[PDB]
Amino acid sequence: GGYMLGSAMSRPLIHFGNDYEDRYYRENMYRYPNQVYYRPVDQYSNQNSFVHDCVNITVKQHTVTTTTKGENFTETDIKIMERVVEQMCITQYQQES
Ligand SMILES: [Cl-]
Ligand code: NA
Ligand code: NA
Q: Which residues pair up as cystines (predicted)?
């Protein structure tokens, strides 16, 4: 058993409220996922619990893939990643519903 993929998308435009995070996302955009992993949407009764799992699974997979190549995420990266992935997971739940 694995997870469903989504198709790759352009990393979303996000106006982060924290200005330094806002700039950091742009500077370091390629560090973050452009596609999401998830359990099938018909297994969820609402957007919120889907997105919750989609973010957890996707961040787990990306962090694992990154760590094993000898690379690292900063605490900033993690905060930005969670937001990025949340937006893509919402998109995915809307597109795939
Ligand atoms: Cl992109
Ligand atoms: Na601000
Ligand atoms: Na990094």
A: 54-89
